[PDB]
RNA sequence: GCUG
DNA sequence: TTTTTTCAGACTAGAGCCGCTG
DNA sequence: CAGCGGCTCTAGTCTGTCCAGC
């Protein structure tokens, strides 16, 4: 299959690149800004019940600057670079609020300016031919994925973060061995973790004073009885044995019932706020509200009922005691657990927090005035102010700054001014990955190259100095995957057999034969049979009744089989081999080139597919035609996409040796070359241009 | 061992009563009389032999009789049998012969 | 043992054939640049690539990487590269030579920042030390850390022969 | 490229809180000779060096 | 001692710690031992997909889901055991596929609760329940056909 | 792979749909079967099913601690009070068991009494976890703490064991008038109408 | 020479295993006198050289051997009256290997253990082959003590040293004599120079603070030499030992081994200044003030 | 952020 | 009201602990 | 039967992590 190449020209036509920047932010503003005012939709007046501020549609609109009182003009990048202005477009809302007595709905009220991406769908650069590019004195030849702030342009790097919803076990620096699910959902983000701390477990969350046995936690789940807990955990000798410690500590104590535990986890959850929260929440209905939203939120109660939460806390609580029996701690460093987080993520995260205060705010102004300032009517709409949103995203973008302090975040180097060296130096720039741990000098941790980073990141690609390993480049035809809705998901694992983990006893759970489903995170159920779960859920997506990139993985030594359709998550495209052969068959490879077919096609007629690091797990990938055997699975559609955009331009980068390929990635940006076609228009603080380029 | 009530199947402590020694619950009246022998053996794993035995070691399981090894036809060779785990395994026999111009090892 | 014992063999024949005329071998008979390793591995056969002195370890579950089989100790499946870099690597080849490639990259960076402290924490305990016309080495506060320096009482550039002063053999030949 | 590398400081600016040169070259600059550079100069056992360098041309 | 209120050792399948001195079966194995071995009736318990290849009978609807509650008494399928243990369930034009649940070994009693009277009723055990079959559409046959 | 042994017709019936619930025991093996202990009382809500049972417990058998069975009767109920009491006599009689409800939807479960040569189908109104209930200590401790310091109404119902001839009688009801052969008017949809109908186009 | 290291391995101490951390580490290990170093190494000397059997004996007196190992099975017997978890031991195990141990020594070992068995319930049955704990006085003693002691009773250390954990008997191999030393990891310098059979007086350490505990300073001042001139040949790296030998002796000569670190400066200088321009200028300023 |  | 974002390290108090020490 | 001596123990906490150059 000679034009086996011609396949990541056409997967880069649409994907690929800098894509997996402009496709990120085209679903912030297209899909999450939605589920984030669905979310924080409503704010509730304390001074009068009757007052209520629903948000009915959020829209953004298209980038235009006006420099009158009225004039709305739209705008274009070159201006704003020259100008030292803001590329960035209107945020309009709809809302029905109160008023004085009626339900007003207003369409249309602008809630402040959001900052755009060259090349997103919002962008006027978009569908613009060549000719149309010189007109808007834009380089047609320019990667796009940068935003204009201040007459800046500013790239925000991707951020590798360990995945959420995920339970991670790692040992403590005692050595004792814990686990830690980190709980990211719509609505609050919070970290609970579990501790053997005295040989007995304790559960530890911020809202919690002190760390609770967790025998307690279970029976304010609802799982009152000691056999029902130990049938849950293990049923084995050792497991069931090592738990004993922990059995006593609740029969020292007298907790017996639900109400004397939940009393206990309430004497001890902090109540910072005793000011303006009027009163309510006794102890026992506090720790009712904890043990249902603060606790394991990604795990839903349907009314009250924690049946689903106390299995999930009886998996986490099994994973911590097989572990400290052979010390087999999950490795940090595989990159099947780690999610990289892209620009849509981190403003978001920003946005989220930057509606909340604007609600906050205008919550506050009208339980101040409505019933004291006058009968006259409080009217929101004349009070709220387009300033909170506006100027709150321009900083954190102008300065690289996301102290947010509700989900205590607090990382500075998000962004950093595009670098306009040469044109390699932009591209290398959009293609870059900043580590999460960034102080650590051990030399075998995040700074090693990892046998997981096959194919997704540049071997070669790093900085020398400080950052050797901490900063990492993407690949050529990489796949950052964005979330998908898992309405489909849930229905074929019902029908393919997946038994509800509400209707048996936890005792099945320690049966060899039957593993459990885990969707994102949260569980399915338990089917006996892996391989066919396996097996069929990918012969639905090769025809295309799910999505290309969920992906289906099965580990044997904890038998569990995990879906996953969150995002973040790096894929690769391979071609699928049958029976020793590979399914390109030529005639396809000649079709795409020729038109008849693109390259969704070859997905959907099950000639290539997605692998992520966890399903390359599973898979026998072999390089070449000729390495197939009867074991391999799949075969790599093109080998030289493994290096980066930096590293592909060396030549013969085989015949030497390693190190000197990375001194040429960090050497080719620095070099000085064209930049653009429109480089004699820009007027940048720094441009060093080669008179005669070859 | 944990065993566990039939009642509500809270675990069960063993306490002494006036007449017998009891597992008792501690949330429910139900007590259970001790009233014969009963144990619970563990069986732990025990130390490697492999290294122990090699190097002219003090065996001593030969005896009159004895079968020559299967090679050399002659009965200048030791036999024994040991456990390699604990004592529920079934024993294995092995035997190592020595002779001039002859070093072998077998099963 | 065994995969050292190819490399150095496939180097011994790479010598043999050499010219006495090649560029490569005359700055490694005289140590200008390079050394014998070096053309071994451009010309023969670069070796197994070791981390930590032992075979790539295992990235995924039982298997360095998705194209060899699981729980396979064979080599090249654990980072053994027959190739020349003259031939050119494979790409699986090419990838382990790049991880023990990283691990002096990361190692240098490291190790300047440590030997840098260690060398302020020294120099911030002996500056004060000096020797004196009496010939004992004594502290700022007038303690007797040694009676002479050294026992011998001799200075370590001025030593003509491995920590001795003279190496009279050659004295007498002059 | 070395025209922009190339700096050189005799009597400049000093900066208003230590009365020590300047940092940067833009600013005229000065040399910061460090700890490591007066250790070396201690093992050469040189102290008038170590005092003019240190005091006289820099803060006396 | 009561011989029949023994402390319950934690397996349950494993109850007896103190005396007065498992492998895994297959459906076609289930089904055979309930026909030839012994005659004895008894009750299984199977989950059906979420729909069935029907439509509601007149019942005023959209293409919405079709369960049993929705049918009529009578025949509704035949079940096939095949060779080589494969077991299937021929419900329509399709067939379903047949396997064992997770063996669940806590007591499953099957009760009928009926109100028969505004504030009164009766409660009625008719026994219990030990065998859990699973049935799922074979995605492979029905989207290889189309 | 010809269907060489058991075609066997499954049939359906619909003359207990409503009626039929299946209640499982979490904690109780399936050795220990409550065929044998009388049952004083069932409870009921038809509408948010959520069955509440009492057990009554022996006192001359040996494994109940006549000391400490007095102690926790007293401590729950005031020493001669017996106006409203959990346990009439002195000592704990009566253990409770507190359902909880396993799922919204049942439509998909079905209870299959199996005969030679035919299989009869039943749907099942509900699924329920039956678990041994811990209010006494609640409410003893209610009544420690006072000397120191719901719409839908009850259905009664009266239990019929395994044992009852009631049992065997009503075990009938899940037959349906046999029907010797006939393919079903329903469920005769095509493969690719059955395909689309389980994965709807998005 | 730190610096300049290329940080190849290659340093096992031609084993193939236990690899000593050897670079710049192993001199941070050295100068900053830490008690605590990573890869202790006691290198003994046999009084016989050249029998492996009596390696073997010697190995089973300095290395630890747990109760469970040297246990055929471990049963908590519950009776009418009294329960006792009763250990029972093999008797062919215990002479198979050379190891000294009787149900009276087991019986000594189990109290003074930290399981609370100190007081003398703890009986002897039989010859040797079964010992009785009966239970505890306090801390949940029903069967609760009694689960505790039958997961902790097979972790007692019957016979060896405990602090010493994987001797390795190391064979020499030259011609004309082979010779065998074994190399324990471990730190009980004192009692791996005493146990029968391990020439004391060749028994060496890699740890300064346990040579200096148990040797005098003067010792203390030739393994620092030692240490020193060991790892830095190691790594290539030639040095003079003119500076080691000032190295050493100005780390021990006020009494007792100064490591160099931020706290051996407060017991070398009186000068306040020199101790202001190193680490903790906040406490060190305000304490010469007081 | 990069050069040293 | 809601995450972490290095890795040791040799000091400084307490908590006991058990046993002789009177 | 009672007490204070040292133990001994876990965590706790503050303290570093190359030089500079733009
Ligand atoms: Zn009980
Ligand atoms: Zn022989």
């Given amino acids: 299959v000679e034009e086996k190449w011609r396949l990541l020209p056409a997967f880069l036509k649409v994907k690929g690149l800098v894509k997996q920047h402009i496709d990120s932010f085209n679903y912030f503003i297209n899909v999450e800004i939605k589920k984030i005012m669905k979310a924080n939709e409503k704010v509730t007046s304390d001074a009068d019940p009757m007052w209520y501020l629903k948000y009915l549609n959020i829209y953004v609109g298209l980038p235009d600057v006006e420099e009158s009182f009225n004039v709305t003009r739209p705008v274009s990048p070159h201006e704003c670079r020259l100008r030292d202005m803001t590329y960035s477009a209107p945020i309009t809302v709809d809302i029905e609020y109160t008023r004085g007595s009626q339900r007003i709905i207003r369409n249309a009220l602008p809630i402040g300016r959001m900052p755009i991406m060259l090349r997103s769908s919002n962008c006027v650069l978009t569908g613009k031919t060549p000719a149309e590019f010189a007109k808007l004195n834009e380089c047609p030849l320019d990667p796009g994925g940068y935003f204009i702030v201040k007459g800046v342009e500013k790239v925000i790097l991707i951020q590798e973060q360990l995945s959420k919803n995920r339970i991670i076990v790692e040992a403590d620096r005692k050595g004792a061995v814990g686990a830690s699910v980190t709980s990211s959902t719509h609505e609050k983000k919070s970290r609970t973790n579990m501790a053997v701390k005295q040989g007995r477990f304790y559960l530890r969350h911020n809202t919690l004073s002190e760390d609770i046995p967790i025998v307690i936690i279970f029976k304010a789940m609802g799982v009152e009885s000691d056999q029902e807990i130990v049938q849950m955990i293990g049923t084995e000798e050792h497991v069931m044995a090592a738990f004993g410690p922990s059995l006593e500590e609740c029969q020292k104590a007298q907790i017996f019932t639900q109400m004397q535990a939940l009393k206990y986890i309430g004497n001890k959850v902090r109540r910072q706020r005793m000011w303006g929260g009027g009163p309510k929440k006794t102890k026992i209905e506090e720790a009712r509200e904890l043990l249902a939203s603060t606790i394991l939120t990604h795990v839903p109660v349907k009314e009250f009922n924690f049946r689903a939460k106390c299995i999930y806390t009886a998996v986490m609580v099994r994973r911590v005691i097989l572990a400290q029996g052979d010390n087999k701690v999950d490795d940090r460093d595989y990159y099947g657990n780690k999610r990289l987080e892209l620009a849509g993520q981190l403003l978001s995260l920003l946005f989220e927090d930057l509606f909340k205060k604007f609600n906050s705010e205008m919550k506050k102004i009208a339980d101040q005035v409505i019933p004291k300032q006058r009968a006259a009517q409080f009217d929101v709409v004349k009070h709220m102010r387009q300033d909170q949103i506006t100027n709150g995203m321009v900083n954190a973008i102008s300065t690289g700054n996301w102290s947010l302090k509700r989900f205590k975040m607090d990382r500075q180097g998000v962004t950093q001014v595009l670098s306009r060296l040469s044109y390699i130096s932009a591209l290398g720039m959009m293609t870059r990955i900043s580590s999460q741990f960034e102080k650590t000098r051990k030399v075998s941790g995040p700074r090693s190259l990892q046998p997981s980073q096959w194919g997704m990141l540049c071997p070669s690609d790093t900085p020398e100095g400080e950052a050797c390993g901490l900063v990492k480049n993407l690949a050529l035809m990489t796949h950052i995957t964005t979330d998908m809705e898992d309405g489909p998901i849930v229905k074929l694992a019902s029908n393919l057999g997946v038994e509800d983990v509400n209707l048996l006893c936890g005792e099945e759970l320690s049966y060899p034969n039957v593993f459990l489903v885990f969707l994102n995170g949260n569980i399915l159920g338990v089917i006996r049979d892996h391989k066919k779960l396996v097996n069929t859920f990918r012969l639905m997506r090769r025809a295309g009744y799910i999505n290309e990139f969920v992906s289906i993985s099965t580990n044997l030594t904890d038998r569990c089989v995990y879906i996953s359709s969150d995002g973040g998550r790096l894929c690769r495209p391979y071609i699928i081999v049958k029976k020793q052969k590979p399914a390109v068959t030529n005639k396809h490879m000649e079709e795409l080139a020729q038109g008849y077919r693109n390259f969704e096609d070859f997905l959907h007629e099950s000639l290539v597919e997605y692998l992520d690091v966890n399903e390359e797990n599973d898979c026998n990938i072999a390089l070449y035609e000729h390495t197939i055997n009867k074991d391999t699975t799949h075969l790599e559609i093109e080998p030289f996409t493994l290096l980066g955009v930096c590293a592909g331009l060396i030549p013969y980068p085989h015949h030497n040796q390693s190190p000197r390929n990375t001194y040429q990635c960090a050497m080719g940006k620095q070099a000085m070359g064209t930049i653009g076609y429109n480089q004699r228009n820009r007027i940048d603080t720094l441009m060093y241009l080669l008179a005669y380029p070859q | ?107 | 043992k065994e995969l050292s014992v190819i490399r150095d063999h496939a180097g011994s024949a790479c010598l043999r054939e050499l010219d006495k005329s090649n560029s490569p071998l005359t700055m490694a008979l005289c140590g200008s640049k390079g050394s014998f390793i070096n053309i071994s591995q451009m010309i023969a056969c670069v070796g197994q690539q070791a981390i930590s002195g032992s075979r790539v370890p295992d990235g995924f579950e039982n298997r360095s990487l998705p194209h060899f089989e699981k729980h396979s100790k064979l080599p090249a499946a654990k980072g053994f590269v027959a190739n020349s870099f003259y031939s050119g690597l494979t790409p699986t080849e090419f990838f382990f030579h790049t991880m023990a490639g990283r691990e002096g990259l990361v190692d240098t960076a490291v190790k300047t920042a440590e030997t840098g402290y260690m060398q302020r924490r020294l120099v911030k305990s002996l500056e004060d030390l000096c020797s004196q016309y009496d010939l004992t080495v004594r502290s700022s506060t007038g303690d007797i850390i040694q009676f002479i320096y050294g026992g011998d009482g001799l200075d370590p550039a001025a030593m003509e022969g491995k920590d001795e002063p003279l190496e009279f053999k050659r004295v007498l030949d002059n | ?60 | 001692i009561i011989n029949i209120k023994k402390e319950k050792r934690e397996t349950d399948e494993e109850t007896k710690q103190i005396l007065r001195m498992l492998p895994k079966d297959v459906s076609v194995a289930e089904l055979l031992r309930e026909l030839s071995l012994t005659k004895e009736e008894e009750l299984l318990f199977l989950q059906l997909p979420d729909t069935l290849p029907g439509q509601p009978p007149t019942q005023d609807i959209a293409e919405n889901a079709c369960t049993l509650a929705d049918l009529t008494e009578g025949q509704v399928g035949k079940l096939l055991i095949r060779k080589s243990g494969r077991v299937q369930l021929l419900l329509g034009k399709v067939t379903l596929d047949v396997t064992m649940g997770t063996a669940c070994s806590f007591l499953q009693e099957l009760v009928s609760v009926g109100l028969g009277d505004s504030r009164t009723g009766e409660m009625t055990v008719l026994g219990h329940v030990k065998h859990k079959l699973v049935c799922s559409p074979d995605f492979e046959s029905l989207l290889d056909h189309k | 792979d010809d269907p060489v042994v058991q075609e066997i017709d499954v049939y359906l019936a619909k003359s207990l749909a409503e009626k039929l619930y299946l209640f499982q025991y979490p904690v109780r093996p399936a050795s220990m079967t409550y065929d044998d202990i009388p049952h004083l009382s069932a409870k009921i809500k038809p509408k948010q099913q959520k069955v509440e049972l009492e057990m009554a417990i022996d006192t001359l058998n040996p494994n109940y601690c006549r000391s400490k069975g007095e102690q926790i009767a007293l401590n729950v109920d005031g020493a001669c009070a017996d106006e409203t009491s959990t346990y009439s006599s002195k000592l704990m009689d009566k253990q409770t068991f507190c359902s909880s409800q396993t799922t919204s939807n049942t439509s998909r479960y079905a209870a299959a009494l199996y005969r030679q040569g035919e299989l009869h189908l039943t749907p099942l109104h509900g699924i329920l976890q039956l678990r041994p209930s811990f209010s006494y200590l609640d409410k003893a401790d209610a009544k420690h703490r006072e000397r120191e310091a719901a719409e839908e109404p009850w259905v009664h119902l009266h239990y019929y064991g395994l044992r009852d001839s009631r049992s065997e009688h009503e075990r009938q009801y899940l037959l349906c008038p046999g029907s010797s052969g006939v393919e079903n008017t329903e469920l005769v949809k095509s493969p690719s109408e059955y395909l689309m109908m389980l994965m709807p186009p998005s | ?290």
């Fill in chain 2, 1 to 107: 061992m944990l065993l566990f009530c039939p009642g509500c199947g809270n675990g069960l402590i063993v306490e002494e009563g006036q007449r017998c020694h009891r597992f008792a619950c501690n949330t429910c009246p139900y007590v259970h009389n001790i009233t014969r022998k009963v144990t619970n053996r563990k069986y732990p794993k025990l130390k490697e032999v492999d290294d122990v035995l090699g190097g002219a070691a003090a065996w001593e399981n030969v005896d009159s009789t004895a079968e020559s090894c299967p090679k050399c036809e002659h009965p200048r060779a030791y036999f024994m049998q040991l456990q390699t785990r604990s004592a529920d395994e079934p024993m294995t026999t092995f035997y190592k012969c020595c002779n001039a111009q002859c070093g072998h090892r077998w099963r």
């Fill in chain 7, 1 to 290: 020479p730190g610096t300049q290291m290329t940080l190849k391995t290659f340093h096992f101490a031609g084993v193939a295993s236990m690899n000593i951390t050897l670079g710049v580490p192993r001199i941070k290990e050295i100068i900053n006198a830490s008690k605590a170093i990573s890869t202790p190494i006691i290198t003994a000397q046999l009084d016989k050289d050249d029998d492996a059997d009596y390696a073997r004996l010697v190995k089973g007196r300095i290395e630890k051997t747990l109760l469970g190992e040297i246990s055929e099975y471990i049963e908590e017997v519950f009776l009418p009256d009294d329960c006792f978890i009763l250990v029972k031991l093999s008797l062919e195990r215990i002479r198979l290997l050379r190891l000294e141990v009787n149900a009276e020594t087991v019986r000594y070992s189990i109290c003074t253990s930290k399981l609370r068995v100190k007081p003398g319930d703890v009986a002897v049955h039989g010859e040797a082959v079964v010992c009785v704990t009966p239970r505890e006085n306090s801390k949940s003693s029903m069967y609760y003590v009694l689960q505790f002691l039958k997961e902790d009773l097979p972790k007692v250390v019957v016979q060896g040293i405990p602090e010493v954990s994987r001797a390795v008997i190391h064979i020499d191999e030259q011609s004309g004599k082979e010779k065998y030393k074994l190399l324990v990891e471990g730190d009980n310098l004192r009692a791996v120079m005493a146990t029968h059979g391990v020439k004391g007086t060749r028994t060496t350490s890699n740890n300064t603070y346990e040579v200096e505990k148990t040797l005098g300073i003067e010792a203390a001042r030739t393994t620092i030499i030692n240490e020193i001139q060991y790892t830095m040949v190691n790594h290539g790296m030639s040095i003079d030992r003119r500076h080691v030998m000032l190295l050493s002796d100005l780390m021990t000569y006020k009494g007792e081994v100064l490591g160099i670190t931020r706290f051996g400066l407060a017991k070398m200088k009186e000068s306040v200044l020199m101790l202001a321009s190193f680490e903790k200028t906040a406490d060190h300023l305000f304490d010469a003030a007081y």
């Fill in chain 4, 1 to 60: 490229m070395v025209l922009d590398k190339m700096h050189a400081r005799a009597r400049g600016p000093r900066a208003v809180l230590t009365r020590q040169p300047t940092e940067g070259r833009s600013r005229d600059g000065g040399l910061r000779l460090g700890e490591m550079e007066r250790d070396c100069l201690i093992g050469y056992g040189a102290s008038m060096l170590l005092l003019e360098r240190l005091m006289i041309s820099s803060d006396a």
